[PDB]
Amino acid sequence: AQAEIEAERKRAREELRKQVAILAVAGAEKIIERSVDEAANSDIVDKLVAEL
Amino acid sequence: DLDLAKASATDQLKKAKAEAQVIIEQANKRRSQILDEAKAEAEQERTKIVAQ
DSSP states (O other): OOHHHHHHHHHHHHHHHHHHHHHHHHHHHHHHHHSSSHHHHHHHHHHHHTOO | OOOHHHHHHHHHHHHHHHHHHHHHHHHHHHHHHHHHHEEEEEEEEHHHHHHO
């Protein structure tokens, strides 16, 4: 019965990590869509051309 | 007299031969039961610890 619980600790830990990890990117999307609306775009488009 | 004593001992000997079977063939189903009860004991124990 012990390995049967060890597996469950691993599985619950992973279950939680999944949710945190997707909510992170959802939050980054909205935050990014609030803050690049300015001339900040001109930097991005100029950044790759120096490496393009 | 001898013939009669021999028949009387003979039937008793049949009964000895048969009850040597009855005792241990009861003991064998009991040997089974003693362990198959432990199966239930430990299975419920495992399930209880896992539930806890």
